[PDB]
Design a protein around this ligand. Structure first.
Ligand SMILES: [Mg+2]
Ligand SMILES: [Mg+2]
Ligand SMILES: [Mg+2]
Ligand SMILES: [Mg+2]
Ligand SMILES: [Mg+2]
Ligand SMILES: [Mg+2]
Ligand SMILES: [Mg+2]
Ligand SMILES: [Mg+2]
Ligand SMILES: [Mg+2]
Lengths: 100, 206, 142, 141, 62, 68, 140
RNA sequence: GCGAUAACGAACGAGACCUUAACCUACUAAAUAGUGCCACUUCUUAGAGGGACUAUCGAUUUCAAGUCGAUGGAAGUUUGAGGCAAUAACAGGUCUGUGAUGCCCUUAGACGUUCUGGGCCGCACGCGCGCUACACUGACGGAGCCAGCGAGUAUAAGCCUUGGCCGAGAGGUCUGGGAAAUCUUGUGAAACUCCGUCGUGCUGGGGAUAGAGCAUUGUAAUUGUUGCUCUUCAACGAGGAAUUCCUAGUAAGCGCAAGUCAUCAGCUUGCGUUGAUUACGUCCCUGCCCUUUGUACACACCG
């Protein structure tokens, strides 16, 4: 047995929730007790620039955004099982960090 | 009438409010009546309130102002001149003290005196301008009951404000003096000089 | 509570060659004396045990002399050095608090002490311009 | 019923505990209380020169009573106010650190406070006893 | 000697800036002699607005 | 204002011209029916379409409508 | 456990979570009695849900609210809403629905905000001005 | 859009759409959230959805598009706010954002690059965006004591910084936490409320100008970087002709954070606290659009 935390972070929620559900599924068919996924409050990285490359015209501003979505999953399973679950549910967009 | 014992003790005077809803738990609306048929529907005293602070939505539709309590419209109009905008608790404090002064003076019901000053302060004919692109022109027209009421409140609070500016006399008792004088029709008061001068110009234009 | 007196009130006071209105409260009456602000008068009154609830004319001569004594000798009455007007003096290095007539004398002496060495600040004092780096393009219009 | 600090109005509880703590007399008052300003944002010393330290210590004690291991920096933030910067807009500025730190040290050696674990200063075993006592003897009148 | 006249029909906005309204008033007593008059403030139907002088009709405002 | 556009007016009258027997005077039923009859990309447009189809049905039951 | 209902009232940002358990008429604000809620001049806003129906409705129930966020006034309105809704939810769950509808009738006939949270929120600020609609002064 | 109709049926733009706010005791879970006594998801977070479509009823209307009243509702002003945004066009602004660029100029005593010091701050003056005020709806003094949007580091070149201890303050020092729903931080913000002093006075309003001193950042503070202490106590007693912004959680106050940033915010970009007066109308001024009309204009009346 091993209390293992898996942290999932990404900008887009569709692949994040797909990876989250796939991990929960593999922690379900394997009779491994789980807590999650826990949807952390999304972070809005906001940048408000001036439209003008120069400084002429009406003062108009862009407001760019970068939403960051975070999920944490707690598993009670051996590290080999959890890591191979990670390789089962590996996705380019979503990054994964595993902590014991 | 029985006193209801709770685990969290409740004071006697506020337990007395179960019988009747009174302004500041001190002033009753029951024996108060508007001495003008034309402003009954625009002076709202039928629904009693405890404190002149309701935080209602009276600016959405056109005539929602007529449903706001008349005292709440007065305390809303008190908070003017920049430094007082948004200071409603201060305005309510001023109204609450003003009512007590209006009670100790002339002994009448303070909100009856308020109603009398409002019915007595609104000009019944105002001379609107009909100038054709710059030239001076005036025509005497009638004044709607809603504008008559809310101009009464505007003039009453403006007069109290100017009487309390740079004066040792406090705003609550300047409002009390302005309200009492307009209630009894004295021409010494502001908003009665203004009302007479307004209806005089309207008489000089028809 | 309200109390009455006869012959003790003094309509006009004269302290440190300054005329003091006798109907001003003592803490703010002393502020007429140049070099004495509200903060300083509050402390000289607390060091002289003169309760602030008294008008200027209420004070007796014994208290008035005890106050002018404290104002003229602040460090001797446990008044901190940092609280004083003129601390670490230029010539003798001791902490001072200048008063009515000494203030303009030592302010002048500071102006000439800067102009004699021809510092930039002394020069701008000579020219009558602002010395603390303020922009003078658009506000020095008086 | 058992009266507690939360069951009595703060303003007259503080007015009663300041009087009790002064007549009790064991609180040590630093020597600069007649000189100092409470905050750098203040412009004048307290008008109640003789009693302000006692009342402030009573307020600090009650405030710590209702919370858990509040530090002295938080007390500086609590008692700080808007500074009257001349032509620039107003700003919040903290109160003096020494006055609050001296108050909490005086209450800690008078028995009302102690160093709390993971920082701050908790209220003492007898601090609850005597604040709840003052609360009981405050609102019966 | 003021006379009270309930409004029974709101004719329309008149005047140069539209700040005055033509309205159709009916007297409370002697329910006849219906008159067209101008009013400054906002007006709904069934307003008991009083008239300082009665013997005058109203027309468009400039 | 609350003036419906042509994308809702013509889509509602195609519904009437195509499924009048299956329609009704109830918004909830019309709302469910047009969700299985038409491919509507957004819920807001579905509700607007069903609310005007309901209005048109309510007007048809009172007599003949012009254009449908 | 026991007959417990949990509710919340809201104003602009203030939110007050009320726990209503079966007991005596104990009514606390963050562990403090309601007779000393500040500001004092708005104390009758929270006295309204009490004196409108009569304190006898609170004999069998104790109400403890925890109000956080918002401001002083927004917290007062959140508290009075949490109290009124907690009383209604208790009547609806452990008393006949006739009384719950009676209470809702007096409450709605007196003030909509007793049961329905006011939906007004602050408009966002837009660039080109210091406020939502206000704009920087223009010069020609 | 209705409708009238030599037109009929369409496309772009508008609207739909997308982001955000308001409802959900209805799902899915949460020791990085909260609560009750391990349990649970009301509040908290966020994903899957539901919900509103002017819904129902009255009036008016070409009975049409609609509008105005009510009732229910979380929401009935396009439900609130934005993002995106057509056909052409302007000698609009930027080659001082670009290792984007054509050409011209210069290219070693350089117009390249770098170093030192100064300037961009310089002051008889005119103008624009603002910040403080002229007091009592107030100044101080204690006490009460409530937000939301956010940001935060490693062998650096030093981030957010609690807690203890010094220091009147500003600030200093020693440890620890936080690469963060975990710590700063419940950012205990300011207006605001209570209790006191002041008493219509250029006054305890106002805080310029200036003197002396103490610290911080930085290689460097002089032409005061900035903060703090004492002192100095100016105009200003509500502002001419003119002129700006604004319709509901809006205006006005009131602060807070982020950007710039070694230091410096009277500035912007947002956020929340308190919270109104008055319309809910018109073409009178102003700007723009459309129709008729005249034209010797078409580089289009700056003809
Ligand atoms: Mg929109
Ligand atoms: Mg370029
Ligand atoms: Mg250089
Ligand atoms: Mg420059
Ligand atoms: Mg500007
Ligand atoms: Mg918060
Ligand atoms: Mg900054
Ligand atoms: Mg700038
Ligand atoms: Mg032609």
């Amino acid at each position: 047995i091993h209390k293992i935390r898996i942290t999932l972070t990404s900008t887009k929620v569709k692949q994040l929730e797909n990876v989250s559900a796939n991990i929960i599924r593999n922690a379900a068919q394997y009779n491994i007790v789980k807590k999650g996924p826990v949807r952390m409050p999304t972070k809005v990285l906001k940048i408000t620039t001036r439209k003008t490359p120069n400084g002429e015209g009406s003062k108009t501003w862009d407001a760019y955004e970068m939403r960051i979505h975070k999920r944490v999953i707690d598993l009670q399973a051996p590290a080999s099982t959890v890591k191979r679950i990670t390789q089962i549910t590996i996705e380019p967009g979503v990054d994964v960090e595993v902590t014991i | 009438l029985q006193v209801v014992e709770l685990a969290t003790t409740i004071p006697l005077d506020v337990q007395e409010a179960q019988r009747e809803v009174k302004l500041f738990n001190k002033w009753s609306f029951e024996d108060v009546e508007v001495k003008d048929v034309s402003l009954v529907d625009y002076i709202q005293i039928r629904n009693p309130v405890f404190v002149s602070h309701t935080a209602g939505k009276y600016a959405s539709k056109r005539f929602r102002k007529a449903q706001c309590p008349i005292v709440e419209r007065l305390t809303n109009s008190l908070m003017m001149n920049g430094r007082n905008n948004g200071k409603k608790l201060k305005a309510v404090r001023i109204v609450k003290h003003a009512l007590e002064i209006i009670h100790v003076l002339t002994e009448q019901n303070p909100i009856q005196v308020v109603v009398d000053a409002i019915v007595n302060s609104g000009a019944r004919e105002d001379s609107t301008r009909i100038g054709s692109s710059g030239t001076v022109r005036r025509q005497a027209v009638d004044v709607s009951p809603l504008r008559r009421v809310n101009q009464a409140i505007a003039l009453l609070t403006i007069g109290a404000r100017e009487a309390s500016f740079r004066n040792i006399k406090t705003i609550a008792e300047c409002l009390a003096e302005e309200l009492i004088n307009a209630a009894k029709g004295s021409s010494t008061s502001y908003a009665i000089k203004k009302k007479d001068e307004l209806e005089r110009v309207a008489k000089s234009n028809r | 509570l309200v109390v009455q007196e006869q012959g003790s009130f003094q309509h006009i006071l004269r302290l440190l060659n300054t005329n003091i209105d006798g109907r001003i409260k003592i803490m703010y009456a002393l502020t007429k004396i140049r070099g004495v602000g509200r903060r300083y008068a509050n402390l000289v009154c607390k060091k002289a045990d003169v309760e602030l609830t008294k008008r200027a004319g209420e004070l007796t001569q014994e208290e008035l002399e005890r106050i002018v004594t404290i104002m003229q000798n602040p460090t001797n009455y446990k008044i901190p050095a940092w609280f004083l007007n003129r601390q670490k003096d230029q010539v003798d290095g001791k902490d001072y608090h200048v008063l009515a007539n000494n203030l303009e004398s030592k302010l002048r002496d500071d102006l000439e002490r800067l102009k004699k060495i021809r510092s930039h600040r002394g020069i701008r004092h000579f020219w009558g311009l602002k010395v603390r780096g303020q922009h003078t393009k658009t506000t020095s219009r008086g | 019923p058992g009266v507690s600090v939360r069951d009595v109005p703060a303003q007259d509880f503080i007015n009663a505990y300041a009087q009790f703590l002064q007549r009790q007399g064991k609180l040590e008052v630093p020597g600069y209380v007649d000189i100092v300003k409470t905050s750098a944002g203040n412009d004048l010393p307290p008008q109640e020169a003789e009693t302000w330290f006692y009342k402030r210590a009573a307020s600090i004690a009650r405030h710590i009573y209702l919370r858990k291991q509040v530090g002295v920096g938080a007390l500086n933030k609590l008692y700080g106010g808007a500074k009257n910067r001349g032509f620039r807009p107003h700003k919040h500025v903290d109160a003096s650190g020494s006055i609050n730190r001296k108050c909490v040290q005086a209450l800690q050696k008078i028995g009302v406070l102690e160093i709390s674990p993971k920082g701050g200063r908790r209220i003492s075993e007898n601090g609850q006893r005597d604040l709840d006592r003052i609360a009981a003897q405050t609102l019966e009148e | 000697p003021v006379t009270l006249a309930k409004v029974i029909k709101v004719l329309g906005r008149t005047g140069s800036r539209g700040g005055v309204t033509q309205v159709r008033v009916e007297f409370l007593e002697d329910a006849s002699r219906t008159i067209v008059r101008n009013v400054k403030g906002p007006v709904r139907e069934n307003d008991i607005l009083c008239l300082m002088e009665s013997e005058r009709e109203a027309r468009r405002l400039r | 204002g609350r003036v419906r556009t042509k994308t809702v007016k013509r889509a509602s009258k195609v519904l009437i011209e195509r499924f009048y027997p299956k329609l009704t005077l109830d918004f909830e039923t019309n709302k469910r029916l047009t969700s299985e009859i038409a491919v509507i990309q957004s819920k807001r447009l579905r509700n607007k379409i069903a609310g005007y189809t309901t209005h048109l049905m309510k007007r048809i039951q009172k007599g003949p409508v012009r254009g449908i | 456990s026991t007959q417990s209902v949990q509710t919340f009232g809201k104003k602009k940002t203030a939110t007050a979570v009320a726990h209503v358990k079966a007991g005596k008429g104990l009514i606390k604000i963050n562990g403090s009695p309601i007779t000393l809620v500040q500001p004092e001049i708005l104390r009758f806003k929270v006295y309204e849900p009490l004196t409108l129906v009569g304190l006898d409705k609170f004999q069998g129930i104790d109400i403890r609210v925890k109000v956080t966020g918002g401001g002083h006034v927004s917290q007062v309105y959140a508290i009075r809403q949490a109290i009124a809704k907690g009383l209604v939810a208790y009547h609806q769950k452990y008393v006949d629905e006739a009384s719950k509808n009676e209470l809702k009738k007096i409450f709605a006939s007196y003030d909509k905000t007793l049961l329905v949270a006011d939906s007004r929120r602050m408009e966002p600020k837009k660039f080109g001005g210091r406020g939502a609609r206000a704009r920087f002064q223009k010069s020609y």
